Amino acid sequence: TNLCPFHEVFNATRFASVYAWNRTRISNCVADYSVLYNFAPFFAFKCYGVSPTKLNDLCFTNVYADSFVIKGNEVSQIAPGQTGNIADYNYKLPDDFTGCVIAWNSNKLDSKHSGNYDYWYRSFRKSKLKPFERDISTEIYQAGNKPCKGKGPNCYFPLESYGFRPTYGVGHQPYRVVVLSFELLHAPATVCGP
Amino acid sequence: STIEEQAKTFLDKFNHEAEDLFYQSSLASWNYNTNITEENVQNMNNAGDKWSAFLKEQSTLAQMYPLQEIQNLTVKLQLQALQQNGSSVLSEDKSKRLNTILNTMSTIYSTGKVCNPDNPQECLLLEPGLNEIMANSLDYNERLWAWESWRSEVGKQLRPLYEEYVVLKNEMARANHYEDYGDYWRGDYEVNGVDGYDYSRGQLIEDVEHTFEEIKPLYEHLHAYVRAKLMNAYPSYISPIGCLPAHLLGDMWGRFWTNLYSLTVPFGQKPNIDVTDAMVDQAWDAQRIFKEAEKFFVSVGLPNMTQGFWENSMLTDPGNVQKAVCHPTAWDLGKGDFRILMCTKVTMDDFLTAHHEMGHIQYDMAYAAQPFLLRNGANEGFHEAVGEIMSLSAATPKHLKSIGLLSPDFQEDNETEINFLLKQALTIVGTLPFTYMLEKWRWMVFKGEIPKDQWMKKWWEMKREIVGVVEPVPHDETYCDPASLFHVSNDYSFIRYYTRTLYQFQFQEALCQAAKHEGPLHKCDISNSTEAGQKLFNMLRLGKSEPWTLALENVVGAKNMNVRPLLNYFEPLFTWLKDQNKNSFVGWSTDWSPYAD
Ligand SMILES: *[C@@H]1O[C@H](CO)[C@@H](O)[C@H](O)[C@H]1NC(C)=O
Ligand SMILES: *[C@@H]1O[C@H](CO)[C@@H](O)[C@H](O)[C@H]1NC(C)=O
Ligand SMILES: *[C@@H]1O[C@H](CO)[C@@H](O)[C@H](O)[C@H]1NC(C)=O
Ligand SMILES: *[C@@H]1O[C@H](CO)[C@@H](O)[C@H](O)[C@H]1NC(C)=O
Ligand SMILES: *[C@@H]1O[C@H](CO)[C@@H](O)[C@H](O)[C@H]1NC(C)=O
Ligand SMILES: *[C@@H]1O[C@H](CO)[C@@H](O)[C@H](O)[C@H]1NC(C)=O
Ligand SMILES: [Cl-]
Ligand SMILES: [Zn+2]
């Protein structure tokens, strides 16, 4: 019938960096959910408004899938109402979230010896991130009352790389996160299960 | 816009480029020690040097942010840790000279060799040769020869080097706004800017003097007992009212008296506790030892150990194909990598050492949430005390009876606990006067209170006054006996052991009160007690983000060192001792010397 790209987003080869999270807008689908459980023993299947065990029989308009890679400690920050490094400058969920995140441990694919400095995250920003807004700009961060002209004493580069190594604790381990956000609006709906 | 926000941002950059460089360095050190090769030495070097360069540039920036315009205490502490420029204030040539002096002193101590006159080619190292020569042999002359040869062969070499080391360290300390190097060492126990919780650097000297004045009666009773036993073993070489010769203390420098147990046992017929028979009966190994100790730590409420600890840390001798140095250490590589390196054998001593090392690991895991600069013990004495209270609890007969190592038909008597307490006093009490002696001499030699021409005269005089130990042969000013110790010649503060000895018993009493323990303190155990573990974690989680006085009060309810727990621990031993010493003379005289004829 109408297969869904959920398998595609869940099984990509490189999940994007958290500061440049990859968002896809599923619109035309049958919304099968039997294939969701068998991907991996997910570390956090926390759902925020829809019956997690029985997600069928509910029809929405669009389904947005956002792919990250974040530390284990920062997975708890991906929730409607948390504050911190990631949830203020990288990825902020709306207060009225409808959908749920799916985070699983990926250390055999997202970490190498001598560090895997291919995943970044923003730590300095002049303003907190508003919901579902991404800022990939790498402009220098002026932290002092002086016009800055590059990296120096009181002027820092915003992005800080994720050092991932196969020999780190569970909380500093590379965790792949796929956030599913459902929007419902008065419009011809297509994505939902029978 | 303000200095506080700039400091916050700066410390974030540091707290995140620092974790990476410390891992890449700690990992290099770990895989060098676990696998000694030359490629591994070269890796360790590059990584450590990158670490040091990072710390120096970050220190120039931290110097930039003034400390008088900061309200947050945590940021103040982090910057004060960063702003400490150390020896970089000292000029480049003098810094090179100081580094060369330190390296030469450490090297001379490391390869020290003494050759007997019977064979010039036959010489023995301090470790493990002279240690077993003078720590097991009961001959007076051989012990004297080992002591005198080691001192006359390393102290004479180390004297001018120690003079230059003192001079340049004093210059560096005076350049860093300290009165002398001893003040720099005492700067760790210094906390300022808190109402009622401040601790000046001279307050440490005053406190240690008061605690030693309190400790002295127990030590002198123990010394009288030990002198009586040795005089029984050495009939014509020790005066009943004199002082013990420095080489008759069971160790190279007299630091520990544990080797006197065979000579000074209270009751020689009572079997001593030993679970090694049960270890070889039940075929225990390193994995079982560490699993049992982990289960003990869980019983008090502290969490499990990370899976990475079991996966990669080596707990056993890795054959002979690759050599590994395995002095028992607890590595906190950072970012969650907590590992342990020690060669475990089936022995009760290794069992208690595993308990101590995993107590260290528990401490490291507790404050993992603190920023990088504050991920350490509150002072230099907390880590060892926290590690050692676990070994104290793990050696109790109730604990070993619960595990099944001791048969339940074991008979616990007063003589057995007297023997245990005497062994503890030999190990624990016997080193407090020596530690205080050594640190006091180092303070008074760094401060310029004693002239160079009387380094040794004053040293021996105040050793006979404090420890009650005289030299077997007169020494001129050419010798450098204090420099012959490992810690003195490698620039290590020594009062950390004194403070650890006090803090460990303070913590033990505080925890045993919370474990609703009944009876003597030396029998107490904290296993199967969630309240005691919660109380200990309440201080362990702090790290050094708060003054060590507050961390100490959070457990014991006091803001300073007190000695009453130490005597409360040794009360039965103290009573037995002072009952035995009724026919012996306590105290000592400083006039008597072995060579005075
Ligand atoms: C992703 O797909 C490849 C082949 O298409 C397969 O080998 C792999 O197991 C899949 N990964 C997961 C997590 O299902
Ligand atoms: C997600 O990654 C793919 C792979 O390069 C890319 O083509 C796509 O544009 C990304 N989605 C975004 C940036 O929204
Ligand atoms: C120790 O290091 C050497 C050199 O890198 C290596 O050849 C050897 O396999 C290592 N031993 C191990 C990994 O047990
Ligand atoms: C210092 O700053 C930290 C984080 O900004 C904050 O949690 C702490 O409460 C501050 N200290 C004081 C004394 O306000
Ligand atoms: C982890 O801690 C729990 C709680 O006490 C315990 O039941 C479990 O056995 C521990 N894990 C292991 C591998 O022992
Ligand atoms: C601790 O509790 C366990 C389980 O209740 C018990 O088997 C063990 O004997 C107890 N140990 C002590 C010292 O009470
Ligand atoms: Cl000595
Ligand atoms: Zn230790």
Catalytic residue, chosen from B294, B357, B439, B509, is B357
Residues 6+ apart with CB under 8 A from B374: B74, B77, B78, B81, B367, B543, B544, B545
B542, B386 in Cβ contact below 8 A?
A: no
A111, A168 in Cβ contact below 8 A?
A: yes
Q: Is the peptide bond before B318 cis (omega within 30 degrees of 0)?
A: no
| Strands laid side by side in the A22-26 sheet | A22-26, A62-67, A175-183, A99-105
Region for A114 from its dihedrals, namely left if φ exceeds 0, alpha if ψ lies in -120 to 50, beta otherwise: left
CA atoms within 13 A on the CB side of B6: 21
* Residue B384, marked binder: yes
Residue A106: count of CB within 10 angstroms of its CB: 18
Residues 6+ apart with CB under 8 A from B90: B98, B168, B171, B172, B175
Tokens of B208: 């240690």
Residues 6+ apart with CB under 8 A from B591: none
Residue B63: count of CB within 10 angstroms of its CB: 14
d(CA B467, CA B597): 24
Residues 6+ apart with CB under 8 A from B328: B340, B341, B342, B353, B356, B357
Q: A109 CA to chain B: closest CA distance, Å?
A: 18
B335, B23 in Cβ contact below 8 A?
A: yes
Give the type of residue at B335: K
Cα B425 → chain centroid: 16
C-alpha closest to that of B484 among B216, B152, B141? B152
Cα B28 → chain centroid: 25
Q: Where are the alpha helices (DSSP H) in B371-431?
A: 382-394, 397-403, 414-427
Instruction: Encode A77-122 in three state secondary structure.
Output: HCCCCCCCCHHHHCCCCCCCCCEEEEEEECCCCCCCCCCCCCCEEE
Give chain B positions within 8 Å (CB) of A154. Answer: 6, 10
Interface test with B, best of A165, A170, A173, A175 (most B CBs within 10 A): A165
Tokens of B39: 């490629």
C-alpha closest to that of A180 among A70, A110, A99? A99
Active site residue B357: yes
B37, B105 in Cβ contact below 8 A?
A: no
d(CA A50, CA B103): 67
Domain ranges (residues) in chain A: 1-187+190-194
A48, A81 in Cβ contact below 8 A?
A: no
Closest ligand to C-alpha of residue B15 is 4
d(CA B17, CA B448): 41
Tokens of A176: 């792949």
d(CA A165, CA A115): 5
* Residue B339, marked binder: no
Number of H helices, E strands in chain B: 23, 6
Residues 6+ apart with CB under 8 A from A131: A92, A93, A94, A95
Closest ligand to C-alpha of residue B396 is 6
d(CA B145, CA B135): 13
Tokens of B195: 């109402």
Tokens of B278: 């049960």
Tokens of A194: 């029978």
Of all protein residues, whose CA lies closest to atom 2 belonging to ligand 5?
Answer: B304
Residues 6+ apart with CB under 8 A from B446: B166, B169, B170, B173, B180, B181, B182
Domain ranges (residues) in chain B: 1-596
Interchain contact, B6 vs A154, CB within 8 Å: yes
* Residue B497, marked binder: yes
d(CA B262, CA B269): 12
- The label of the residue with tokens 């315009």 reads B69
Structure resolution in Å?
3.3
Number of H helices, E strands in chain A: 3, 8
Interface test with A, best of B8, B13, B69 (most A CBs within 10 A): B13
A69, A177 in Cβ contact below 8 A?
A: yes
Helix axis angle, B140-175 relative to B92-110, nearest 10°? 170
d(CA B430, CA B192): 33
B418, B375 in Cβ contact below 8 A?
A: no
Backbone angles phi, psi at B411, to 5 degrees: -100, 115
The H or E element that residue A175 is part of is strand A175-183
d(CA B51, CA B31): 17
- Residue B128 DSSP one-character state: I
The contact set of A with B (CB < 8 A) is: 115, 123-124, 141, 143-145, 153-154, 156, 160, 163, 165, 167-173
The contact set of B with A (CB < 8 A) is: 1, 5-6, 9-10, 12-13, 16, 19-20, 23-24, 27, 61, 64, 306-308, 312, 333, 335-338
d(CA B330, CA B32): 15
Burial class of residue B106, CB neighbours in 10 A (0-12, 13-18, 19+): middle
Expt. technique: cryo-EM
CA of B423 to the centre of ligand 5 (A): 35
Tokens of B461: 């005089």
Long-range contacts of B325-328 (CB under 8 A, 24+ apart): B325/B33, B325/B36, B326/B33, B328/B353, B328/B356, B328/B357
B498, B548 in Cβ contact below 8 A?
A: no
| A1-187+190-194 classified as CATH 1.20.1260.10 | no
Give the type of residue at B572: P
Of all protein residues, whose CA lies closest to atom 10 belonging to ligand 2?
Answer: A22
Tokens of B579: 């009952």
Three-state DSSP class for A151? coil
Which of A115, A143, A167 lies at the smallest CB-CB distance from B337? A167
